[PDB]
Amino acid sequence: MNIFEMLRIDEGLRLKIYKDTEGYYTIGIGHLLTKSPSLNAAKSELDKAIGRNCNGVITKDEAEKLFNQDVDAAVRGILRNAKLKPVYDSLDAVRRCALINMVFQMGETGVAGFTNSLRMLQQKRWDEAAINLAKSRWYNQTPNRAKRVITTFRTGTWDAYK
Ligand SMILES: [Cl-]
Ligand SMILES: [Cl-]
Structure with a gap:
């Protein structure tokens, strides 16, 4: 995929x-x-x-x-993006797809706004980030797509899409 x-x-x-x-x-x-x-x-x-x-x-x-x-x-x-770049660089190939996904949907300014979540992704605290990401309008509005993206960050596999 x-x-x-x-x-x-x-x-x-x-x-x-x-x-x-x-x-x-x-x-x-x-x-x-x-x-x-x-x-x-x-x-x-x-x-x-x-x-x-x-x-x-x-x-x-x-x-x-x-x-x-x-x-x-x-x-x-x-x-x-000064805020995005570092995160992306720190991530593996799958997870990188997940960040591109949020950016396409919500724009660079938007995602650049998830300060906390970004910080936890960088630290590789997967479960914490998955939990914090869900506390957002984004997740409340398009919950199934949010869930797919979030599982991708939590797991690092393409499970949610297969
Ligand atoms: Cl919320
Ligand atoms: Cl949805």
């Missing part, structure tokens, strides 16, 4: 504009378009993004190309 197959399971694929769990305008593999209420402000973002007139609908390829971009962006933002 790898980072792409993991996110594809957590986010799903959709070829038509839709609203995310928070109510935002999204498309493809969890690509957020706009936090704006307007379907028009969404269609326009979408055309800029693809380089064509989409009229709210894209192909598989287009969907995957956006996904490639977003994963890369997520990885580079982690390596550029």
Whole structure:
């Protein structure tokens, strides 16, 4: 299993504009378009993004190309963040996937906010971190996806995804 197959399971694929769990305008593999209420402000973002007139609908390829971009962006933002970088560096290969997962979903600023959890992950206190991570809006809103991610950090295996 790898980072792409993991996110594809957590986010799903959709070829038509839709609203995310928070109510935002999204498309493809969890690509957020706009936090704006307007379907028009969404269609326009979408055309800029693809380089064509989409009229709210894209192909598989287009969907995957956006996904490639977003994963890369997520990885580079982690390596550029003074708070994230060190954590990532301290982690093994699986766990590293788990942090990329939170970052793709919640943004760098967001995860950079889990000060305590970050500190415990760095210290390799797995069980403690799993417990602290659950005390968050994140976990309360998307509990099953949170659980999957959290098990990945606790265990270091891909069990929750198999
Ligand atoms: Cl809480
Ligand atoms: Cl969920």
